[PDB]
């Protein structure tokens, strides 16, 4: 009789909790701070930024500082969940196209540092598709550090068709910081960045037609919306509200030559054989925090409809809890009567 | 990956219906076949004798089913297909928009009921 722990590690935040809950009970920043002259994690690291050098162990969805990642996992088990990792099965998530060597390192740490008794590694986008009640579709997962388009057919990702875009929410926060200089604001420090991130989440939206929105917004002050800063000062944001997330569609705004999210989704579908494309176009599922902008579904629908053959039926699905759809999918999967047969046990791992 | 109901799946021509109940796959009483609770999600396996057997898996989502139920119905569909060596064709069926193939499995046609089993969430 044992309940699995579900941990979804992102570039910006970790989501953690117990199988069978409808949402993660723990969400904290994926940050490790160590003295400038042993380590602090998450919210406590930010409250001590003056004393610590802060680092992000996950870059563009890939674990890249293993020592600090181990600190994140220790904090998850001991300080957030108060769970003995050696006494629970664990479901852990990984990015699309995560190298097998990285999964192997993640597994070694879980079995040999934390002594987990059993573990299962799931692909984030696949969990999100399941949380939407689908086995076939294409997931557009846009987080803080990376965006992926992942075609999935009858339950399994098609690896040769997955796209990775390094543009995601943190680039958008930084772009908002940049364009607010037009108005005289000089947000630049790590703490100011977390304020601008909140402005972005509260005030931004995606225009249905960017050129037309620029024109209408210039004709009155109705575009302008206010935001109360921590110091009590008020900031007014205008067309920055939609110019900021427009960079998802026009990465040149950021000085990137990358294709936008609409083109990338189209290209990902085209990599799949023609006989399954209809099911992908009809099941474009949004996932992750950077897909939360008002207007995103309508805009993507227009733009992908333009690109795709006119015989296709384009349907963009925007689940309301999609900020946590990976974690939710993991909670469902690890609750099923069959999960016990999917995991790898420590004894199996240790004997090779 | 097995399960007692997996062991019974697709052994003979016919129609098998399971309801998702608290993260598990529970047989629907045969007297109820064709009636579907709008609050629930179900997995349906149609087995046809060709020499070999042909398999169509449908997962049916009621308009009021909870996220755990629709998610589990999708996952169990994948797992059943895997148990059938991938040879099943999977079909998503939404209340009121089901394929003619799926409706055709029920001589009395598809009908819906208010209610359903409690969410696992
Ligand atoms: N309502 C919102 N509107 C716009 N952006 C949002 C909203 N809510 C959260 N975000 C952005 O979503 C990002 C975090 O999303 P998520 O938690 O999916 O990323 P992650 O899993 O930490 O990162 P990744 O998946 O890139 O490794 C941040 O950039 C955050 O500002
Ligand atoms: Ca993520
Ligand atoms: Ca129900
Ligand atoms: Ca199949
Ligand atoms: Cl077109």
Short mmCIF file of C-alpha atoms and ligand atoms in Angstrom, two decimals:
data_model
loop_
_atom_site.label_atom_id
_atom_site.label_comp_id
_atom_site.label_asym_id
_atom_site.label_seq_id
_atom_site.Cartn_x
_atom_site.Cartn_y
_atom_site.Cartn_z
CA UNK A 1 0.00 0.00 0.00
CA UNK A 2 1.94 3.05 -1.26
CA UNK A 3 1.18 6.28 -3.08
CA UNK A 4 3.49 7.49 -5.81
CA UNK A 5 5.09 10.92 -5.82
CA UNK A 6 4.83 12.92 -9.05
CA UNK A 7 7.60 15.41 -9.87
CA UNK A 8 7.64 17.56 -13.03
CA UNK A 9 10.90 19.52 -13.23
CA UNK A 10 10.86 22.58 -15.46
CA UNK A 11 13.35 25.21 -16.45
CA UNK A 12 11.53 27.78 -14.33
CA UNK A 13 9.45 25.87 -11.80
CA UNK A 14 9.13 22.45 -10.23
CA UNK A 15 5.66 20.97 -9.77
CA UNK A 16 5.39 18.22 -7.17
CA UNK A 17 2.79 16.28 -5.29
CA UNK A 18 1.05 12.95 -4.83
CA UNK A 19 -0.60 10.64 -7.33
CA UNK A 20 -4.34 11.08 -7.41
CA UNK A 21 -4.46 14.82 -6.72
CA UNK A 22 -5.90 17.07 -9.43
CA UNK A 23 -3.08 19.62 -9.11
CA UNK A 24 0.44 19.81 -7.67
CA UNK A 25 0.51 20.73 -3.99
CA UNK A 26 4.07 22.09 -4.38
CA UNK A 27 5.18 24.60 -7.01
CA UNK A 28 8.46 26.44 -6.50
CA UNK A 29 11.21 28.09 -8.59
CA UNK A 30 13.86 25.82 -10.11
CA UNK A 31 16.67 27.86 -8.55
CA UNK A 32 19.61 26.87 -6.33
CA UNK A 33 21.59 29.49 -4.44
CA UNK A 34 24.99 28.90 -2.84
CA UNK A 35 26.99 31.34 -0.70
CA UNK A 36 28.87 34.04 -2.59
CA UNK A 37 31.71 33.44 -0.10
CA UNK A 38 25.49 24.71 1.76
CA UNK A 39 22.66 25.42 -0.71
CA UNK A 40 19.19 26.97 -0.71
CA UNK A 41 16.39 26.19 -3.14
CA UNK A 42 13.31 27.88 -4.52
CA UNK A 43 11.56 30.71 -2.75
CA UNK A 44 14.07 30.76 0.10
CA UNK A 45 16.92 31.19 -2.39
CA UNK A 46 15.26 34.28 -3.84
CA UNK A 47 14.68 35.75 -0.39
CA UNK A 48 18.47 35.46 0.11
CA UNK A 49 19.69 36.55 -3.35
CA UNK A 50 21.84 39.20 -1.64
CA UNK A 51 23.84 36.43 0.07
CA UNK A 52 23.82 33.80 -2.69
CA UNK A 53 24.84 33.16 -6.27
CA UNK A 54 21.69 31.85 -7.99
CA UNK A 55 21.71 29.21 -10.74
CA UNK A 56 19.10 27.38 -12.83
CA UNK A 57 20.00 23.65 -13.04
CA UNK A 58 17.58 23.02 -15.95
CA UNK A 59 18.31 24.83 -19.22
CA UNK A 60 15.73 24.70 -22.02
CA UNK A 61 14.13 21.73 -20.31
CA UNK A 62 17.36 19.70 -20.01
CA UNK A 63 19.04 19.00 -16.69
CA UNK A 64 22.54 20.52 -17.04
CA UNK A 65 23.84 21.06 -13.47
CA UNK A 66 23.52 17.67 -11.79
CA UNK A 67 24.87 18.72 -8.38
CA UNK A 68 22.32 21.51 -8.10
CA UNK A 69 19.56 19.31 -9.55
CA UNK A 70 20.15 16.88 -6.72
CA UNK A 71 19.62 19.81 -4.30
CA UNK A 72 16.31 20.58 -6.03
CA UNK A 73 15.19 16.98 -5.64
CA UNK A 74 16.25 16.87 -1.98
CA UNK A 75 14.27 20.06 -1.35
CA UNK A 76 11.27 18.57 -3.15
CA UNK A 77 11.19 15.41 -1.01
CA UNK A 78 12.26 16.78 2.37
CA UNK A 79 11.17 20.40 2.56
CA UNK A 80 8.12 20.49 0.28
CA UNK A 81 6.48 17.05 0.46
CA UNK A 82 8.08 15.79 3.70
CA UNK A 83 8.17 12.37 2.02
CA UNK A 84 10.81 9.67 2.39
CA UNK A 85 11.91 9.08 -1.23
CA UNK A 86 13.21 5.64 -0.35
CA UNK A 87 9.64 4.64 0.60
CA UNK A 88 7.61 5.80 -2.44
CA UNK A 89 7.53 5.05 -6.16
CA UNK A 90 8.35 8.24 -8.09
CA UNK A 91 7.11 9.41 -11.48
CA UNK A 92 9.57 11.90 -12.99
CA UNK A 93 9.17 13.82 -16.22
CA UNK A 94 11.60 14.63 -19.00
CA UNK A 95 11.70 16.90 -22.00
CA UNK A 96 10.97 15.71 -25.52
CA UNK A 97 14.20 14.48 -27.13
CA UNK A 98 16.00 14.23 -23.78
CA UNK A 99 19.19 12.22 -24.49
CA UNK A 100 19.23 8.72 -23.11
CA UNK A 101 22.46 9.49 -21.25
CA UNK A 102 20.62 12.22 -19.35
CA UNK A 103 17.74 9.92 -18.48
CA UNK A 104 20.33 7.39 -17.28
CA UNK A 105 21.94 10.00 -15.01
CA UNK A 106 18.52 11.00 -13.61
CA UNK A 107 17.85 7.30 -12.94
CA UNK A 108 21.22 6.70 -11.27
CA UNK A 109 20.64 9.62 -8.91
CA UNK A 110 17.14 8.47 -8.00
CA UNK A 111 18.13 4.87 -7.37
CA UNK A 112 21.58 5.42 -5.83
CA UNK A 113 21.40 8.83 -4.09
CA UNK A 114 17.74 8.82 -3.05
CA UNK A 115 17.23 5.03 -2.99
CA UNK A 116 13.80 5.33 -4.55
CA UNK A 117 12.18 1.87 -4.61
CA UNK A 118 10.63 2.23 -8.06
CA UNK A 119 10.50 4.93 -10.69
CA UNK A 120 9.00 5.73 -14.06
CA UNK A 121 10.16 8.45 -16.49
CA UNK A 122 7.49 10.03 -18.67
CA UNK A 123 7.76 12.46 -21.58
CA UNK A 124 6.14 15.77 -20.58
CA UNK A 125 4.17 16.31 -23.81
CA UNK A 126 2.75 12.78 -23.75
CA UNK A 127 1.43 13.30 -20.23
CA UNK A 128 -0.21 16.53 -21.35
CA UNK A 129 -1.92 14.82 -24.29
CA UNK A 130 -3.30 12.17 -21.93
CA UNK A 131 -4.54 14.85 -19.51
CA UNK A 132 -6.61 16.24 -22.44
CA UNK A 133 -8.30 12.88 -22.97
CA UNK A 134 -6.47 12.03 -26.21
CA UNK A 135 -4.10 9.41 -27.58
CA UNK A 136 -3.40 11.20 -30.90
CA UNK A 137 -2.60 14.84 -31.40
CA UNK A 138 0.20 17.36 -31.51
CA UNK A 139 1.18 19.07 -28.27
CA UNK A 140 2.56 22.61 -28.30
CA UNK A 141 4.29 22.85 -24.90
CA UNK A 142 5.68 26.31 -24.16
CA UNK A 143 7.21 26.86 -20.74
CA UNK A 144 9.80 29.23 -19.26
CA UNK A 145 12.86 27.94 -21.06
CA UNK A 146 11.77 25.91 -24.10
CA UNK A 147 8.91 25.30 -26.50
CA UNK A 148 8.35 21.97 -28.23
CA UNK A 149 5.88 20.69 -30.80
CA UNK A 150 5.36 16.96 -30.27
CA UNK A 151 3.24 14.83 -32.62
CA UNK A 152 1.82 11.76 -30.86
CA UNK A 153 0.02 8.87 -32.53
CA UNK A 154 -1.94 6.20 -30.67
CA UNK A 155 -0.14 7.02 -27.47
CA UNK A 156 3.46 7.48 -28.60
CA UNK A 157 5.48 10.47 -29.69
CA UNK A 158 6.93 10.43 -33.19
CA UNK A 159 10.56 11.38 -32.48
CA UNK A 160 11.51 12.32 -36.04
CA UNK A 161 8.80 15.05 -36.08
CA UNK A 162 9.45 16.78 -32.75
CA UNK A 163 10.59 20.41 -32.95
CA UNK A 164 12.48 22.36 -30.25
CA UNK A 165 12.31 26.17 -30.11
CA UNK A 166 14.48 27.82 -27.50
CA UNK A 167 12.00 30.74 -27.32
CA UNK A 168 9.66 30.63 -24.33
CA UNK A 169 8.40 32.59 -21.34
CA UNK A 170 11.71 33.90 -19.98
CA UNK A 171 12.56 35.35 -23.38
CA UNK A 172 9.17 37.06 -23.35
CA UNK A 173 9.77 38.47 -19.86
CA UNK A 174 13.15 39.79 -21.00
CA UNK A 175 11.56 41.27 -24.12
CA UNK A 176 8.95 43.07 -22.05
CA UNK A 177 11.77 44.45 -19.88
CA UNK A 178 13.45 45.72 -23.04
CA UNK A 179 10.47 47.38 -24.68
CA UNK A 180 9.38 49.08 -21.44
CA UNK A 181 12.47 51.24 -21.89
CA UNK A 182 10.49 53.08 -24.57
CA UNK A 183 8.36 54.43 -21.70
CA UNK A 184 11.31 55.22 -19.43
CA UNK A 185 11.30 52.09 -17.28
CA UNK A 186 14.63 50.48 -16.47
CA UNK A 187 13.79 47.04 -15.11
CA UNK A 188 17.04 45.07 -15.04
CA UNK A 189 17.78 43.29 -11.72
CA UNK A 190 16.81 39.68 -11.00
CA UNK A 191 14.12 40.86 -8.57
CA UNK A 192 12.80 43.40 -11.08
CA UNK A 193 12.62 40.58 -13.64
CA UNK A 194 10.25 38.66 -11.37
CA UNK A 195 8.05 41.77 -11.19
CA UNK A 196 8.04 42.15 -14.99
CA UNK A 197 7.16 38.46 -15.29
CA UNK A 198 4.06 39.17 -13.20
CA UNK A 199 3.19 42.23 -15.32
CA UNK A 200 3.47 40.02 -18.43
CA UNK A 201 1.18 37.36 -16.98
CA UNK A 202 -1.39 39.89 -15.77
CA UNK A 203 -1.57 42.33 -18.68
CA UNK A 204 -0.35 40.72 -21.89
CA UNK A 205 -2.50 39.14 -24.60
CA UNK A 206 -2.11 37.83 -28.14
CA UNK A 207 -3.58 39.91 -30.94
CA UNK A 208 -5.80 38.15 -33.44
CA UNK A 209 -4.17 40.21 -36.20
CA UNK A 210 -1.04 42.01 -35.11
CA UNK A 211 -0.99 44.79 -37.73
CA UNK A 212 -4.65 45.60 -37.12
CA UNK A 213 -4.11 45.67 -33.34
CA UNK A 214 -1.22 48.11 -33.74
CA UNK A 215 -3.50 50.37 -35.76
CA UNK A 216 -6.48 50.22 -33.39
CA UNK A 217 -4.33 50.62 -30.28
CA UNK A 218 -2.79 53.83 -31.67
CA UNK A 219 -6.21 55.48 -32.08
CA UNK A 220 -7.07 55.78 -28.36
CA UNK A 221 -5.75 55.13 -24.85
CA UNK A 222 -8.10 52.20 -24.28
CA UNK A 223 -5.17 49.79 -24.75
CA UNK A 224 -3.52 51.15 -21.64
CA UNK A 225 -3.76 49.10 -18.46
CA UNK A 226 -2.32 49.84 -15.04
CA UNK A 227 -0.31 47.66 -12.69
CA UNK A 228 0.63 48.34 -9.08
CA UNK A 229 4.31 47.75 -8.37
CA UNK A 230 5.51 46.52 -4.96
CA UNK A 231 6.69 50.03 -4.05
CA UNK A 232 3.12 51.24 -4.65
CA UNK A 233 4.01 53.12 -7.82
CA UNK A 234 1.69 52.48 -10.75
CA UNK A 235 2.86 51.51 -14.24
CA UNK A 236 0.84 51.91 -17.42
CA UNK A 237 1.36 49.44 -20.27
CA UNK A 238 -0.02 49.98 -23.75
CA UNK A 239 0.75 48.14 -26.98
CA UNK A 240 3.51 46.30 -25.13
CA UNK A 241 0.64 44.14 -23.86
CA UNK A 242 0.41 42.37 -27.23
CA UNK A 243 3.81 43.20 -28.74
CA UNK A 244 5.48 41.10 -26.04
CA UNK A 245 3.83 37.72 -26.82
CA UNK A 246 3.83 38.56 -30.53
CA UNK A 247 7.46 37.40 -30.36
CA UNK A 248 6.15 33.81 -30.19
CA UNK A 249 4.93 34.32 -33.77
CA UNK A 250 7.68 36.74 -34.89
CA UNK A 251 10.94 35.72 -33.21
CA UNK A 252 12.78 38.40 -35.15
CA UNK A 253 11.37 40.78 -32.51
CA UNK A 254 13.95 39.08 -30.24
CA UNK A 255 16.69 39.04 -32.85
CA UNK A 256 16.18 35.31 -33.39
CA UNK A 257 16.03 33.79 -36.88
CA UNK A 258 13.81 30.98 -35.58
CA UNK A 259 10.41 30.19 -37.01
CA UNK A 260 7.40 31.19 -34.94
CA UNK A 261 5.15 28.77 -33.08
CA UNK A 262 2.58 28.56 -35.91
CA UNK A 263 5.18 27.71 -38.55
CA UNK A 264 6.90 25.28 -36.16
CA UNK A 265 3.63 23.42 -35.48
CA UNK A 266 2.96 23.20 -39.21
CA UNK A 267 6.49 21.93 -39.91
CA UNK A 268 6.14 19.29 -37.16
CA UNK A 269 2.90 17.98 -38.67
CA UNK A 270 4.47 17.88 -42.15
CA UNK A 271 7.22 15.56 -40.86
CA UNK A 272 4.49 12.97 -40.19
CA UNK A 273 3.19 10.82 -42.96
CA UNK A 274 0.29 12.28 -44.87
CA UNK A 275 -2.18 9.61 -43.71
CA UNK A 276 -2.08 10.78 -40.04
CA UNK A 277 -1.90 14.55 -40.51
CA UNK A 278 -5.69 15.08 -40.34
CA UNK A 279 -5.76 13.70 -36.79
CA UNK A 280 -2.87 15.98 -35.79
CA UNK A 281 -4.40 19.14 -37.26
CA UNK A 282 -7.69 18.31 -35.54
CA UNK A 283 -6.02 17.88 -32.14
CA UNK A 284 -3.51 20.69 -31.57
CA UNK A 285 -3.25 20.73 -27.77
CA UNK A 286 -1.68 23.65 -25.93
CA UNK A 287 0.39 22.97 -22.80
CA UNK A 288 2.53 25.02 -20.43
CA UNK A 289 2.51 28.44 -18.85
CA UNK A 290 3.47 30.38 -21.98
CA UNK A 291 0.36 29.10 -23.74
CA UNK A 292 -1.87 30.92 -21.19
CA UNK A 293 -2.15 34.25 -23.04
CA UNK A 294 -5.66 35.36 -23.83
CA UNK A 295 -6.20 35.10 -27.55
CA UNK A 296 -3.67 32.37 -28.26
CA UNK A 297 -6.12 29.76 -29.54
CA UNK A 298 -7.88 32.06 -31.97
CA UNK A 299 -4.59 33.42 -33.30
CA UNK A 300 -3.00 29.99 -33.73
CA UNK A 301 -6.17 28.74 -35.43
CA UNK A 302 -6.03 31.51 -38.01
CA UNK A 303 -2.30 31.17 -38.62
CA UNK A 304 -2.17 27.37 -38.89
CA UNK A 305 -5.31 27.36 -41.07
CA UNK A 306 -3.51 29.72 -43.46
CA UNK A 307 -0.42 27.47 -43.64
CA UNK A 308 -2.18 24.10 -43.80
CA UNK A 309 -3.91 22.57 -46.81
CA UNK A 310 -7.44 23.94 -47.03
CA UNK A 311 -8.87 20.40 -46.83
CA UNK A 312 -7.69 20.06 -43.22
CA UNK A 313 -9.81 20.75 -40.16
CA UNK A 314 -7.75 22.78 -37.70
CA UNK A 315 -8.72 22.57 -34.03
CA UNK A 316 -6.62 24.18 -31.32
CA UNK A 317 -7.47 22.91 -27.82
CA UNK A 318 -6.69 25.21 -24.85
CA UNK A 319 -7.42 23.31 -21.64
CA UNK A 320 -8.09 25.65 -18.69
CA UNK A 321 -5.56 23.99 -16.34
CA UNK A 322 -2.91 23.56 -19.03
CA UNK A 323 -0.26 25.31 -16.90
CA UNK A 324 -0.16 22.02 -14.96
CA UNK A 325 -1.24 19.50 -17.61
CA UNK A 326 2.06 17.59 -17.50
CA UNK A 327 1.80 17.12 -13.75
CA UNK A 328 -1.90 16.24 -13.96
CA UNK A 329 -1.19 13.61 -16.62
CA UNK A 330 1.48 12.13 -14.36
CA UNK A 331 -0.95 12.06 -11.45
CA UNK A 332 -3.51 10.17 -13.56
CA UNK A 333 -0.98 7.72 -15.01
CA UNK A 334 0.60 6.92 -11.63
CA UNK A 335 -2.85 6.35 -10.14
CA UNK A 336 -3.88 3.68 -12.59
CA UNK A 337 -4.28 0.09 -11.57
CA UNK A 338 -1.56 -0.76 -14.15
CA UNK A 339 1.17 1.67 -13.04
CA UNK A 340 2.84 -1.01 -10.86
CA UNK A 341 3.77 -2.91 -14.01
CA UNK A 342 5.26 0.11 -15.81
CA UNK A 343 7.94 1.13 -13.35
CA UNK A 344 11.50 -0.06 -12.84
CA UNK A 345 12.39 -1.25 -9.35
CA UNK A 346 15.61 -0.44 -7.52
CA UNK A 347 16.47 -4.14 -7.29
CA UNK A 348 16.13 -4.52 -11.06
CA UNK A 349 18.27 -1.44 -11.64
CA UNK A 350 20.96 -2.48 -9.17
CA UNK A 351 21.30 -5.92 -10.73
CA UNK A 352 21.65 -4.19 -14.15
CA UNK B 1 1.64 -4.54 -18.95
CA UNK B 2 -1.40 -6.75 -18.00
CA UNK B 3 -4.48 -6.54 -15.68
CA UNK B 4 -7.34 -9.05 -15.14
CA UNK B 5 -9.51 -7.34 -17.73
CA UNK B 6 -6.64 -7.18 -20.20
CA UNK B 7 -6.41 -10.96 -19.89
CA UNK B 8 -10.07 -11.15 -21.04
CA UNK B 9 -9.79 -8.60 -23.85
CA UNK B 10 -10.21 -9.55 -27.49
CA UNK B 11 -10.29 -13.31 -27.08
CA UNK B 12 -13.53 -13.92 -29.03
CA UNK B 13 -15.51 -11.94 -31.60
CA UNK B 14 -17.87 -9.56 -29.89
CA UNK B 15 -18.22 -6.33 -27.99
CA UNK B 16 -16.61 -5.47 -24.63
CA UNK B 17 -17.34 -2.28 -22.70
CA UNK B 18 -15.55 -1.05 -19.59
CA UNK B 19 -16.20 2.06 -17.55
CA UNK B 20 -13.43 4.03 -15.86
CA UNK B 21 -14.14 3.87 -12.13
CA UNK B 22 -11.65 5.33 -9.64
CA UNK B 23 -8.62 4.89 -11.91
CA UNK B 24 -9.52 1.33 -12.94
CA UNK B 25 -11.25 -0.43 -15.83
CA UNK B 26 -14.51 -2.03 -14.67
CA UNK B 27 -16.77 -4.15 -16.92
CA UNK B 28 -20.13 -2.58 -17.74
CA UNK B 29 -23.06 -4.91 -16.94
CA UNK B 30 -24.10 -6.26 -20.35
CA UNK B 31 -27.74 -5.29 -19.73
CA UNK B 32 -26.61 -1.64 -19.93
CA UNK B 33 -24.72 -1.85 -23.21
CA UNK B 34 -25.53 1.12 -25.42
CA UNK B 35 -26.58 3.39 -22.56
CA UNK B 36 -23.80 5.71 -21.41
CA UNK B 37 -23.61 8.00 -18.39
CA UNK B 38 -22.87 11.55 -19.43
CA UNK B 39 -20.76 11.90 -16.27
CA UNK B 40 -18.39 9.07 -17.23
CA UNK B 41 -15.76 7.77 -19.63
CA UNK B 42 -15.64 4.31 -21.17
CA UNK B 43 -13.40 2.00 -23.21
CA UNK B 44 -14.97 -0.19 -25.91
CA UNK B 45 -13.28 -3.05 -27.76
CA UNK B 46 -14.93 -4.47 -30.85
CA UNK B 47 -13.38 -7.75 -31.95
CA UNK B 48 -14.10 -9.11 -35.44
CA UNK B 49 -13.18 -12.53 -36.83
CA UNK B 50 -11.57 -12.17 -40.26
CA UNK B 51 -8.62 -16.12 -40.03
CA UNK B 52 -7.21 -13.70 -37.46
CA UNK B 53 -8.96 -11.17 -35.21
CA UNK B 54 -9.41 -7.47 -36.00
CA UNK B 55 -9.61 -4.97 -33.13
CA UNK B 56 -11.13 -1.49 -32.86
CA UNK B 57 -10.72 0.38 -29.56
CA UNK B 58 -12.97 3.33 -28.89
CA UNK B 59 -12.81 5.56 -25.84
CA UNK B 60 -16.06 7.41 -25.20
CA UNK B 61 -16.09 10.67 -23.25
CA UNK B 62 -19.24 11.95 -21.61
CA UNK B 63 -19.83 15.68 -21.58
CA UNK B 64 -19.61 15.78 -17.77
CA UNK B 65 -16.87 13.22 -17.14
CA UNK B 66 -14.02 14.29 -14.93
CA UNK B 67 -10.46 14.81 -16.12
CA UNK B 68 -9.20 11.70 -14.32
CA UNK B 69 -11.81 9.64 -16.19
CA UNK B 70 -11.08 10.94 -19.70
CA UNK B 71 -7.34 10.82 -19.06
CA UNK B 72 -7.54 7.26 -17.75
CA UNK B 73 -9.74 6.18 -20.66
CA UNK B 74 -7.10 7.47 -23.09
CA UNK B 75 -4.23 5.77 -21.21
CA UNK B 76 -6.07 2.47 -20.81
CA UNK B 77 -6.80 2.54 -24.56
CA UNK B 78 -3.07 2.81 -25.31
CA UNK B 79 -2.27 0.04 -22.82
CA UNK B 80 -4.90 -2.31 -24.24
CA UNK B 81 -3.63 -1.66 -27.76
CA UNK B 82 -0.10 -2.45 -26.57
CA UNK B 83 -1.39 -5.66 -24.97
CA UNK B 84 -2.92 -6.49 -28.39
CA UNK B 85 0.54 -6.04 -29.99
CA UNK B 86 -0.42 -2.64 -31.34
CA UNK B 87 -2.90 -4.14 -33.76
CA UNK B 88 -5.95 -2.24 -32.56
CA UNK B 89 -7.08 0.94 -34.28
CA UNK B 90 -7.85 3.62 -31.70
CA UNK B 91 -10.85 5.98 -31.92
CA UNK B 92 -11.83 8.92 -29.71
CA UNK B 93 -15.62 9.25 -29.39
CA UNK B 94 -17.21 12.36 -27.89
CA UNK B 95 -20.82 12.30 -26.64
CA UNK B 96 -23.14 13.37 -29.44
CA UNK B 97 -20.40 13.27 -32.12
CA UNK B 98 -19.61 9.57 -32.28
CA UNK B 99 -18.55 7.83 -35.48
CA UNK B 100 -21.15 5.86 -37.43
CA UNK B 101 -18.99 2.77 -36.83
CA UNK B 102 -19.32 3.19 -33.07
CA UNK B 103 -23.06 3.92 -33.18
CA UNK B 104 -23.43 0.83 -35.40
CA UNK B 105 -22.29 -1.48 -32.60
CA UNK B 106 -25.61 -0.92 -30.76
CA UNK B 107 -28.76 -2.18 -32.46
CA UNK B 108 -30.86 0.18 -30.30
CA UNK B 109 -28.54 3.09 -31.02
CA UNK B 110 -26.57 5.14 -28.57
CA UNK B 111 -28.37 6.67 -25.61
CA UNK B 112 -27.22 8.83 -22.72
CA UNK B 113 -28.12 9.05 -19.04
CA UNK B 114 -27.64 11.65 -16.35
CA UNK B 115 -25.22 10.78 -13.58
CA UNK B 116 -22.12 8.68 -13.31
CA UNK B 117 -19.57 7.25 -10.94
CA UNK B 118 -17.67 9.61 -8.65
CA UNK B 119 -14.40 11.12 -9.82
CA UNK B 120 -11.16 9.67 -8.52
CA UNK B 121 -9.81 13.24 -8.16
N1 LIG C 1 -1.06 33.54 -17.32
C1 LIG C 1 0.14 33.51 -17.98
N2 LIG C 1 0.28 34.23 -19.11
C2 LIG C 1 1.49 34.17 -19.73
N3 LIG C 1 2.60 33.51 -19.37
C3 LIG C 1 2.39 32.82 -18.24
C4 LIG C 1 1.19 32.76 -17.50
N4 LIG C 1 1.32 31.96 -16.38
C5 LIG C 1 2.59 31.52 -16.43
N5 LIG C 1 3.28 32.02 -17.55
C6 LIG C 1 4.65 31.81 -17.94
O1 LIG C 1 4.85 30.40 -18.05
C7 LIG C 1 6.23 30.10 -17.78
C8 LIG C 1 6.28 28.89 -16.82
O2 LIG C 1 5.56 27.90 -17.54
P1 LIG C 1 5.93 26.33 -17.14
O3 LIG C 1 5.72 26.18 -15.73
O4 LIG C 1 5.09 25.59 -18.09
O5 LIG C 1 7.45 26.29 -17.51
P2 LIG C 1 8.63 25.23 -16.95
O6 LIG C 1 8.03 23.86 -16.94
O7 LIG C 1 9.12 25.83 -15.67
O8 LIG C 1 9.69 25.51 -18.07
P3 LIG C 1 10.06 24.54 -19.45
O9 LIG C 1 8.84 23.72 -19.74
O10 LIG C 1 10.34 25.61 -20.45
O11 LIG C 1 11.29 23.78 -18.99
C9 LIG C 1 6.86 31.42 -17.19
O12 LIG C 1 7.56 32.09 -18.22
C10 LIG C 1 5.61 32.18 -16.78
O13 LIG C 1 5.80 33.60 -16.77
CA1 LIG C 2 7.72 22.13 -18.45
CA1 LIG C 3 -17.85 10.24 -13.44
CA1 LIG C 4 -2.58 0.35 -32.73
CL1 LIG C 5 -4.77 27.18 -46.21
#
